[PDB]
Design a protein around this ligand. Structure first.
Ligand SMILES: *[C@@H]1O[C@H](CO)[C@@H](O)[C@H](O)[C@H]1NC(C)=O
Length: 115
């Protein structure tokens, strides 16, 4: 993976997903975890069908927060250090979650508008 990438025309540092990234994602995406998973399926064989249905079977009854957290756990389990901030941010941008992407990248003004 590259050490940097371009986001919104801005250079940002890449890294493996962090615990903080996973918590922030799980706190925010809700039902959109499935659409983000669909985006991640394209570059992650281990998330291809029926893996998202398996995740739902195992965790839907534990709630929306836990399902989203477990999506990223499976991504990291499969890809290791190649499960990067860049790949997650790209999936978020595709799925109309740019504010969340900015949060992960540290670009969000903490005292800005409510998202
Ligand atoms: C993914 O798409 C397939 C085909 O429509 C569907 O059967 C499956 O339940 C979907 N998995 C989800 C939405 O988690």
């Amino acid at each position: 993976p590259a050490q940097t990438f371009l986001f919104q025309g801005q250079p940002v540092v890449n890294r493996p997903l962090s615990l903080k990234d996973q918590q922030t994602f799980a706190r925010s995406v809700g039902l959109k975890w499935r659409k983000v998973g669909r985006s991640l399926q394209r570059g992650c064989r281990a998330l291809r069908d029926p893996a998202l249905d398996s995740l739902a079977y195992e965790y839907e009854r534990e709630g929306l927060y836990e399902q989203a957290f477990q999506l990223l756990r499976r991504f990291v389990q499969a890809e290791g250090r190649r499960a990067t901030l860049q790949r997650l941010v790209e999936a978020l941008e595709e799925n109309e979650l740019t504010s969340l992407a900015e949060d992960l990248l540290g670009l969000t003004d903490p005292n800005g508008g409510l998202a």
